[PDB]
Amino acid sequence: AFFLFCSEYRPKIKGEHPGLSIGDVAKKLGEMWNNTAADDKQPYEKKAAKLKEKY
DNA sequence: GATCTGGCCTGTCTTACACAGTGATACAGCCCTTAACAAAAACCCG
């Protein structure tokens, strides 16, 4: 569920910060998705499951 | 009857056209870092 949350927060991260490296940005997004509650990634996980079922 | 001529073959003879090869440029595929979920299998006891 954290993968779709990271994918959805990547544009927010690029808007809040200019971005220096994709690796550090991805690490920070993963750390944030792990520190936040699991309910925050529920619609993201639902959209990921929908995209997996459609493809 | 002998001579000149239009038409059907025939062996070349130039050609345009399809490729051929090359250094440099441009797309176009493989790892990277979290990660919570998504699957494939081998083996074992019920």
Side-chain angles (χ1 to χ4, degrees), chain A residues 1 6-7 11 15 18-19 21 23 26 29-30 36-38 43 48-49 51:
Chain A
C6 173
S7 67
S21 179
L29 292 177
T36 188
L51 293 178

